[PDB]
Design a protein around this nucleic acid. Sequence first.
DNA 1: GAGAATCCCGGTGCCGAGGCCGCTCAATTGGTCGTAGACAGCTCTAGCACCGCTTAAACGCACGTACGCGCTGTCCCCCGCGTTTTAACCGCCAAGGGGATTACTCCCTAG
DNA 2: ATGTATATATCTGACACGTGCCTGGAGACTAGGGAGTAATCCCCTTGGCGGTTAAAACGCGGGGGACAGCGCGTACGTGCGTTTAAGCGGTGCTAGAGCTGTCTACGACCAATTGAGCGGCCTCGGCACCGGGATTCTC
Lengths: 104, 104, 79, 75, 94, 92, 96, 93
Amino acid sequence: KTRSSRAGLQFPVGRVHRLLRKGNYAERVGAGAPVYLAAVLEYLTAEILELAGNAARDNKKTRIIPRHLQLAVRNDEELNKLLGRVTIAQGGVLPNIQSVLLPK
Amino acid sequence: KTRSSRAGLQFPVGRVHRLLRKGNYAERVGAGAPVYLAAVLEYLTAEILELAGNAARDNKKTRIIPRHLQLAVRNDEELNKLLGRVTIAQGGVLPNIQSVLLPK
Amino acid sequence: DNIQGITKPAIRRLARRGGVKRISGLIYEETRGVLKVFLENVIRDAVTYTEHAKRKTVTAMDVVYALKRQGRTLYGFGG
Amino acid sequence: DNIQGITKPAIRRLARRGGVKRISGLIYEETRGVLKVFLENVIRDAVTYTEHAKRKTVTAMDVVYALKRQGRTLY
Amino acid sequence: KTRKESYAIYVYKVLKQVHPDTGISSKAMSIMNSFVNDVFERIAGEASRLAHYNKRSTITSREIQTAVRLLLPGELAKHAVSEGTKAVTKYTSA
Amino acid sequence: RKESYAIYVYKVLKQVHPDTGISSKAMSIMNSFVNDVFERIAGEASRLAHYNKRSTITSREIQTAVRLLLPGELAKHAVSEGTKAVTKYTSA
Amino acid sequence: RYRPGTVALREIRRYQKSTELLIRKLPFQRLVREIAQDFKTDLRFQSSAVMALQEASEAYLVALFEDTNLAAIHAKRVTIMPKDIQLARRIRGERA
Amino acid sequence: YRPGTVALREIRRYQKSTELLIRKLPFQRLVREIAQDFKTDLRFQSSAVMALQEASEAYLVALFEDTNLAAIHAKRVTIMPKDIQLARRIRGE
DNA sequence: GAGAATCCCGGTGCCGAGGCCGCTCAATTGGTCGTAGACAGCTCTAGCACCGCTTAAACGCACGTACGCGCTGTCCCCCGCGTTTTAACCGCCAAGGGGATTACTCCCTAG
DNA sequence: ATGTATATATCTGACACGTGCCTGGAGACTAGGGAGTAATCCCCTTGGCGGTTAAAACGCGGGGGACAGCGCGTACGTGCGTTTAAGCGGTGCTAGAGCTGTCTACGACCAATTGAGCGGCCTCGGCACCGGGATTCTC
């Protein structure tokens, strides 16, 4: 009977509707816009959860450390442009050494 | 009769009150906030207009060009760090020649 | 085709108003490349702006709010 | 002695995390001064958020908003 | 106690749905909680300004559709507008 | 009516520089400028209203916001002029 | 009479003194026309729009050439090379 | 004295792990004192101080990556304060 | 010592920047009430400070070798300039396709 | 003489499931005004004329600037002796963070009104443009 189950989606649609009502964005809100928000949110976390999963099995660890999502987010240019300006706590540096800086 | 003349300001209270009312910033708004924003705007265009008059008096011009307002923003470093992200149309840049480029 | 419209003396004038004294020949194609990708990004904003409003013209308000979108806004044509 | 509280080998580890092979000896005071004015610019916004919140101490979310302010958003 | 609002269980069991044998830590829940309300306020603002630029006084699927077609660099928008349209058609089907 | 701010800063300019004029292109430039600062400070007023759950915006919140985004001595002069403006409001 | 260079100094002084556009309008609106017709079909345009992107393009050109000037000064060179503008776009975050 | 091998292992050993470099108590008084500039005896917070620690570490590693890239541009590995001034001026400040 | 190349002083339409009336919405004033900000008062989390053992990290002196730097010979590729020539730009003329707005309406989103 | 190999046996240690609960999302009912459509007027810009003209393309003489190359010294890397004051962790104290209660006055809402800023029209002088003479780096 929940509207998220009626939409066939997993991310909640009443929660984002509640946050949209008192979030002071618009005085009138349509019905399909929170569904569209939940859809694009589910797609974004589905994509980086696939990325964190393949980083986790690349390092062979059952638990995704945030460092796994650092080298998951630095391995694609779309999120290198979407999350390039961001600053991450406990992120480290990806392995990148110039060829000229290496000896011989 | 006007609230700007009642508070001694020049920018109107009702117009900026309608601006902060229909612009969905807050459902409940204040009354000292529009007169105080009018005061802050009065100070801002006072500093801008005095800098523009200083940039126009030394160039011996009765009118203020976009070159004069460009000289008004790009000279004082406080306002230059305030609004340095915004470019000026038909403003140009100040004459800056580095010390290396000077022929000796 | 039509990318040489910003030809060599135009880039020379841009360099002279930019402050660079000496110009090599490889500067011109790189500068028009970054110009044709920067204006491509602005027009990429403007196409979604126009198709949002069901409006088939591009005004000065379109490019001014687009420059507001990439954080390089400009005064003179609305705020 | 707040300037020399931060150690030179800590700046060495920061340089080796940045990818610096050879580093000079006059870089430490200038790097410390740039870091001092950067943290002062951050803590100015942080302390105005503490006076916003009717609190006499600092918390998490004021530093969070102060990091979201100037475009180095904290994660 | 206080009723804290967090979508950690939602991300936790889409992780369990797509990766049935993978674990996670609490710092990770905090870190993509920061992700999803970062993008939630970012794209909620974007659409807001846009619709106000359009001078419209509401937020239906159209404004957020052009906002998510415009905002993020690529690829994820190409799947995202398709899957969002498919989501709103299963909503209107129900 | 099509709202603008022409006669306002014309009166302000006659107050500060009574023998100086300005052009219409520059008038549009300062129109874009006043719209920019108004939208910036109104967005800041909304977000630091939203930070501490306060549904009402008063003078002290956006006072701290102009202490925030403006640098030092301009913020001092702005807050002094703003405080005297609201006290000559509330005196009357 | 014949100099290695002094006309360039007078030219940069006059161009920093002046504020007029140095980019011709017809090739500019021709190239944005080609980009717009490459993206979509049958678009309309305004004149204030194309002088607005003219102002944006000249401001971005002024900023990028100031960037390459400072990078060439710190590189102890007078002639400019595309390595400086490549490092300028890499440092500023325009490409990465 | 073996030159370069120990430095290469050093570069790999803090480009592989994610350890903290700045000590917590020096930086503590540092920011505490920068805080006193605005609020004295400012009761502080552990989340606040590791927020400043990670923000300062990220800014330091970004500025130092900028510095060594523009030094490798300048055909010289070593670092001068004019390189830091160039990186600060070009990057926006 | 000469010469292109500047700055400076004087005439000339002009056409784009100041007033002014008409007046139409928009800021101003007054009444009403229901809720949110502010103050008082309340319970405990957590920040501050100090003591003491452990010890790995930090300072300091000694030296050694590649690398920053100083100088040099060299192509050679950009820079000033004469000669076509080729597209830019100004003045203008008509179309017609698209932007604004009036005007009812109904449904779907506020409550 | 000693590692070790491969199974014990205890034995903690960090992690996922089975009960309460409360509160906010969903079902149902009422309203009104915000998009929806579309027609019509008007306005501007996209083509198309054509002259003419500053300015780009092209080729050629020449001169300092960039290229690799070689030597001089010294500065950071490496190492061991000697601190030291970071880290753990422990305890004691109390400010202040945070939640609840209650009040009341600033402020949203509504109806009438007056007034002042938008605009078409009108008028005129500041500045660019042109012409010719003084003046200053440069060869």
